[PDB]
Amino acid sequence: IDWEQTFRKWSKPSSETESTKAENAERMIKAAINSSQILSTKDISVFPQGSYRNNTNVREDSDVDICVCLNTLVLSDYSLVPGMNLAELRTASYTYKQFKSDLETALKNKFGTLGVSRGDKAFDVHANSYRVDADVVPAIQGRLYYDKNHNAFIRGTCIKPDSGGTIYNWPEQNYSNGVNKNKSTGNRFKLIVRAIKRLRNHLAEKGYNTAKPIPSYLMECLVYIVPDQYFTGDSYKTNVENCINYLYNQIDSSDWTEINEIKYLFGSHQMWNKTQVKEFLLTAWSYIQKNLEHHHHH
Amino acid sequence: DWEQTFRKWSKPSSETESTKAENAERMIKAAINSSQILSTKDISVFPQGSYRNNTNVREDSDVDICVCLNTLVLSDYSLVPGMNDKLAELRTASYTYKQFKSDLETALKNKFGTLGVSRGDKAFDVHANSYRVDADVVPAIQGRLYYDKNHNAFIRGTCIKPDSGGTIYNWPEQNYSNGVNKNKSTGNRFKLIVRAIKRLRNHLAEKGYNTAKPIPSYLMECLVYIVPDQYFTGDSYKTNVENCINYLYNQIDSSDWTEINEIKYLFGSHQMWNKTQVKEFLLTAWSYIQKN
Ligand SMILES: O=c1ccn([C@@H]2O[C@H](COP(=O)(O)NP(=O)(O)OP(=O)(O)O)[C@@H](O)[C@H]2O)c(=O)[nH]1
Ligand SMILES: O=c1ccn([C@@H]2O[C@H](COP(=O)(O)NP(=O)(O)OP(=O)(O)O)[C@@H](O)[C@H]2O)c(=O)[nH]1
Ligand SMILES: O=c1ccn([C@@H]2O[C@H](COP(=O)(O)NP(=O)(O)OP(=O)(O)O)[C@@H](O)[C@H]2O)c(=O)[nH]1
Ligand SMILES: O=c1ccn([C@@H]2O[C@H](COP(=O)(O)NP(=O)(O)OP(=O)(O)O)[C@@H](O)[C@H]2O)c(=O)[nH]1
Ligand SMILES: [Mg+2]
Ligand SMILES: [Mg+2]
Numbered sequence: 001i002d003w004e005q006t007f008r009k010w011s012k013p014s015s016e017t018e019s020t021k022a023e024n025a026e027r028m029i030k031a032a033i034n035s036s037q038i039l040s041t042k043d044i045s046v047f048p049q050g051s052y053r054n055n056t057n058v059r060e061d062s063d064v065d066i067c068v069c070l071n072t073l074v075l076s077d078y079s080l081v082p083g084m085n086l087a088e089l090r091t092a093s094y095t096y097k098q099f100k101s102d103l104e105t106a107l108k109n110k111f112g113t114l115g116v117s118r119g120d121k122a123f124d125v126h127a128n129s130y131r132v133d134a135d136v137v138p139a140i141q142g143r144l145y146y147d148k149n150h151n152a153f154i155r156g157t158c159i160k161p162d163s164g165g166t167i168y169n170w171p172e173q174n175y176s177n178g179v180n181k182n183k184s185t186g187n188r189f190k191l192i193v194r195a196i197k198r199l200r201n202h203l204a205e206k207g208y209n210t211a212k213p214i215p216s217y218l219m220e221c222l223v224y225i226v227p228d229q230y231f232t233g234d235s236y237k238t239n240v241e242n243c244i245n246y247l248y249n250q251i252d253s254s255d256w257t258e259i260n261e262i263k264y265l266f267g268s269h270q271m272w273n274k275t276q277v278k279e280f281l282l283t284a285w286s287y288i289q290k291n292l293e294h295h296h297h298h
Numbered sequence: 299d300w301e302q303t304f305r306k307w308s309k310p311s312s313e314t315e316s317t318k319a320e321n322a323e324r325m326i327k328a329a330i331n332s333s334q335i336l337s338t339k340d341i342s343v344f345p346q347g348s349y350r351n352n353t354n355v356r357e358d359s360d361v362d363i364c365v366c367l368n369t370l371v372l373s374d375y376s377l378v379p380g381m382n383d384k385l386a387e388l389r390t391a392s393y394t395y396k397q398f399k400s401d402l403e404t405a406l407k408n409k410f411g412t413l414g415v416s417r418g419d420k421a422f423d424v425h426a427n428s429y430r431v432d433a434d435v436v437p438a439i440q441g442r443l444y445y446d447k448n449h450n451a452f453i454r455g456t457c458i459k460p461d462s463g464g465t466i467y468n469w470p471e472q473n474y475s476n477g478v479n480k481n482k483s484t485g486n487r488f489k490l491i492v493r494a495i496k497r498l499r500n501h502l503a504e505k506g507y508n509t510a511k512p513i514p515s516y517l518m519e520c521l522v523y524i525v526p527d528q529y530f531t532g533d534s535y536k537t538n539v540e541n542c543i544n545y546l547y548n549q550i551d552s553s554d555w556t557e558i559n560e561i562k563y564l565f566g567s568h569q570m571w572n573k574t575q576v577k578e579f580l581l582t583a584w585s586y587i588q589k590n
């Protein structure tokens with residue numbers, strides 16, 4: 001296996017029409033909102049997120065992630081500021097539940113009932129008439145306070161799944177930090193993200209169980225953590241090896257964040273843990289070598 | 299220990315019920331969207347039955363999915379004398395329920411394979427391990443029950459036309475909403491007791507008590523829904539079950555009960571069950587709970 005040529009091939013985008021798919025999904029979801037007499041009067045931002053936005057998508061059948069964010073509903077994380085975490089007696093006019101229901105109705109009115117399915121977190125939209133395949137998430141404004149000052153917060157999005165709980169997302173920070181790192185590495189960062197995502201997909205489809213619990217976004221975060229110096233040179237294989245090496249040797253003592261540099265990459269709030277990452281890294285390290293004499297599951 | 303037994307029997311069939319229902323819905327929706335005929339039609343694909351209503355107790359229960367063609371309408375005018383299709387603005391359709399059901403069969407077989415799809419008199423039985431689908435997929439069209447001569451004075455549900463003939467009206471949205479309302483008013487005790495009594499019926503049926511055999515799950519869900527909320531209070535599930543059995547046995551003869559949708563009458567020539575069967579089962583269950 002020529003891993004240099006394979007990684008160069010695997011560094012490509014899923015296609016050259018990714019911007020087209022993302023913009024078409026965005027515009028059709030905006031049209032769905034604008035046709036809703038309830039939602040068209042609300043303060044709502046519709047924007048792409050996920051791997052299509054970040055140019056890290058590698059699968060052509062990947063749904064476009066569209067965030068529909070109601071800006072006038074706010075949920076804040078006060079856990080970092082001592083003494084910052086009452087209730088008002090008047091109810092807020094619009095609730096997250098009513099917002100998600102009205103979004104469901106708007107999507108169904110625009111794309112038809114066959115094209116919309118309500119999920120726990122987002123709507124799965126598959127509308128052949130408009131050729132839209134999208135994961136459309138209802139979000140509200142999310143805040144992380146870092147001081148007791150009224151303006152001392154970072155702004156992102158917040159999701160309230162049907163099954164309970166609160167999820168904080170930072171899509172703008174994700175995108176912006178990824179672009180910044182791509183500039184600092186002369187575009188090598190996202191090339192290597194895509195190569196490693198395709199490596200993980202390859203391993204998962206070949207039945208390597210260590211690859212299955214390692215999703216795309218986790219790998220984007222992990223590769224983002226690798227210092228820029230390891231992306232230099234003219235060997236993509238050396239870049240991949242540097243990433244695996246750095247991550248494996250630094251993960252145990254680390255307290256890494258996601259690519260947004262706001263949310264912790266590991267903890268009880270995440271679906272993954274350091275052991276799974278380490279097992280995957282060992283699998284990947286062995287798999288790219290030319291001839292292994294021995295195997296490491298001990 | 300009937301208290302702990304009923305508490306255990308009140309649990310859902312598993313912790314993955316919502317996942318199973320959603321997967322069934324999405325895979326059937328994908329089959330429809332792959333159909334060159336059906337993908338352009340106004341069709342709703344949605345779960346109904348015990349998975350939708352959170353009253354399922356058997357892990358091997360198939361997910362009930364309704365595939366409803368909304369642009370075909372069958373109207374019930376039996377409550378409004380002098381109401382017809384012209385007074386309801388319904389144009390005659392070229393497309394028939396028969397061909398719709400055949401096209402649904404084709405869509406399902408194309409996605410899940412011929413081996414994974416069986417046509418029944420009412421619905422398709424779908425069992426495809428590759429997609430992890432175990433479902434009863436019923437073809438329905440829009441059904442209407444008119445309550446006045448106004449052209450918008452109707453209640454909307456679904457309508458099924460079995461291969462062997464006849465017409466069945468269903469009201470899955472009303473079923474779901476009324477069940478949710480009663481579950482809220484009783485602090486979730488309603489559906490816990492529904493599940494406990496369904497497991498009691500299944501236990502009795504598998505032990506050879508013949509009176510349990512003609513008592514299906516949906517009938518018991520309706521019957522428990524009828525019981526007033528006061529009998530779901532307290533901290534004894536056993537007392538809740540006994541209250542339901544007592545109330546139902548003592549009120550059934552003079553009653554004119556409806557299904558949980560509060561639209562269809564629970565007993566009559568349109569149903570597969572009758573009051574005598576319910577009473578025989580209630581006596582069986584009451585005696586079985588006492589003699590143990
Ligand atoms: O666990 C998660 C999953 C998803 N997300 C957020 O939701 C976005 C989209 O969720 P996603 O599952 O589509 N992941 P994505 O990065 O688009 O990769 P892929 O579709 O496989 O090519 C991610 O990019 C994250 O920003 C999380 O923050 N945490
Ligand atoms: O943190 C998150 C997690 C999830 N999401 C968004 O919510 C969607 C659903 O997230 P999901 O975990 O419910 N299911 P998934 O397998 O990712 O996709 P699907 O097959 O459509 O059910 C994801 O695809 C993301 O777009 C976020 O936006 N942020
Ligand atoms: O006689 C019937 C049978 C079924 N149905 C409708 O069809 C739905 C599903 O039919 P079902 O036979 O699966 N009964 P279900 O309530 O799901 O309980 P379970 O044994 O756990 O599967 C039922 O919930 C009813 O709403 C009727 O309306 N009348
Ligand atoms: O009123 C009805 C009746 C039936 N159905 C749907 O049609 C499916 C088949 O209905 P069925 O009566 O042909 N067979 P069923 O009693 O459900 O199972 P079994 O005893 O093992 O033969 C049911 O499981 C429901 O999903 C309805 O949706 N509404
Ligand atoms: Mg994505
Ligand atoms: Mg997605």
Ligand SMILES: [Mg+2]
Nearest residue numbers: 063124134135
């Ligand atoms: Mg999706």
Ligand SMILES: [Mg+2]
Nearest residue numbers: 347348360362
């Ligand atoms: Mg059922």
Ligand SMILES: [Mg+2]
Nearest residue numbers: 347360362434
């Ligand atoms: Mg069934």
